[PDB]
Amino acid sequence: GSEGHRTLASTPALWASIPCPRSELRLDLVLPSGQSFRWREQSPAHWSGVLADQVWTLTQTEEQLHCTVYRSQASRPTPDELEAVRKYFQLDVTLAQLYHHWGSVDSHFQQVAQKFQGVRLLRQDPIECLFSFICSSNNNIARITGMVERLCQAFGPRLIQLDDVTYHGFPSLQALAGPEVEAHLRKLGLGYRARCVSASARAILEEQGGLAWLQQLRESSYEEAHKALCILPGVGTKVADCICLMALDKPQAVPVDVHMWHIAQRDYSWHPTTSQAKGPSPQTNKELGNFFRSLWGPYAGWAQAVLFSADL
DNA sequence: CAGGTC
DNA sequence: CCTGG
Ligand SMILES: *CCOCCOCCS*
Ligand code: NA
């Protein structure tokens, strides 16, 4: 079929393979699990979405990540285009090695990781990540997804249309800093989060030095990146850790939420000892993150993603 | 209220 | 202070 979303069977000549066993990556545990909100399984086991400013469809067999890209002449992805996929999934980070370390120092991980292999962190764009997770407060994956989708339709550049889906790039800072964006985003149902989207776009672009300020947090320390993000409206401790882990190359960031608290007590018998408060608070949440960073090591945020994936 | 942020 | 379950 020359129209529509492709499948491995329908258009074999347009797919290229990255050697990637299923223990290193499971799309079904990584793409709909609340890292990115913009991947869809348009046909069974085939995930479509925007990757490096282009639309891709991904599906995997036992040893191979099959990829196809929609650019005007149809042809399978080139080696350079496939490298964008490897960088997005950070395939040089070997889960077999990470899982071995986490199981070595943690018996509970070793037990529950066996049925949940292939859970890894995407390397997302800071802009998309920052604003997606600004929208994540008081909100669920289903509603976040719709909010992000309508956000991208209204302000993001049109790319291509496959079947009845028009794919849009994520909006620019300039777009999100434009006139009346908050009112517009309110019409799309973002509620109070609409103000924080507009306010954070204007803050970065008009007070912080622009896109280079955000992107160069990738080179700053984790502590520096977290501090800087927390200046932005809508970015609290938890949101900043999400962005640090998922977009700013801080694999030791541990977004502490009540879900992490339940896991900390149930499976690790953890309780706070730097403070005397017994439940969630700034002080105790910080300790909880430090606790998992010394238990799991510099990739604690990835280990958390494995555990989170078990529950869901 | 529980959850996050002001 | 907001908010959705
Ligand atoms: C409970 C949220 O507090 C108000 C700040 O909102 C930040 C996202 S717009
Ligand atoms: Na803030």
Author numbering: 9 to 79, 83 to 323
The authors write:
Most forms of damage to the heterocyclic nucleobases of DNA are repaired by mechanistically related pathways collectively referred to as the base-excision repair (BER) mechanism. Both the recognition of damaged sites and initiation of repair by BER are performed by DNA glycosylases, lesion-specific enzymes that recognize specific nucleobase damages in the genome and catalyze their excision through cleavage of the glycosidic bond. Among them, 8-oxoguanine (oxoG, OG) presents the greatest challenge to the DNA glycosylases responsible for its repair, due to its unique combination of structural innocuousness, extrordinary mutagenicity, and chronic low-level production. The question addressed here is whether the 8-oxoguanine DNA glycosylase responsible for oxoG recognition and repair in humans, namely hOGG1, interrogates DNA in the same way as the functionally equivalent bacterial enzyme MutM, despite the lack of an overall structural and sequence similarity between these two oxoG repair enzymes. In summary, we present X-ray crystallographic structures of human DNA glycosylase hOGG1 interrogating DNA lesions in their intrahelical position, achieved by covalent trapping of an ordinarily transient state in DNA recognition.
On the basis of this screen, we have selected the Y207C variant, because it crosslinks efficiently but is substantially distant from the active site of the enzyme to participate in the catalysis and does not interact with DNA in native LRC, and crosslinked it through the X8 linker to the minor groove N2-exocyclic amine of 3′ guanine of the target nucleobase. The complex produced a crystal structure at 2.35 Å resolution with an intrahelical target G•C base-pair, hereafter referred to as the interrogation complex (IC). In both IC and EC structures, the target G•C and oxoG•C base-pairs are unambiguously intrahelical, with a root-mean-square deviation (RMSD) of 0.244 Å between the two structures, in which the RMSD superposition was performed for all atoms. In both structures, the target strand remains in the same position with respect to hOGG1, but the non-target DNA strand of the IC structure has translocated by half a nucleotide step toward the 3′ end of the non-target strand, marked with an arrow. For example, R154 and R204 contact the non-target strand backbone, instead of interacting with the C opposite to oxoG (i.e., the estranged C in LRC). In addition, Y203 does not invade the helical stack and remains at the periphery of the minor-groove face of DNA. Similarly, N149 rests on the minor-groove face of the target G•C (in IC)/oxoG•C base-pair (in EC) and hydrogen bonds with both bases. In the presence of oxoG, hOGG1 establishes a stable contact with the target strand, while in the case of G it fluctuates back-and-forth. Consistent with this, the target strand with oxoG shows smaller root-mean-square fluctuation (RMSF) of atomic position than that with G.
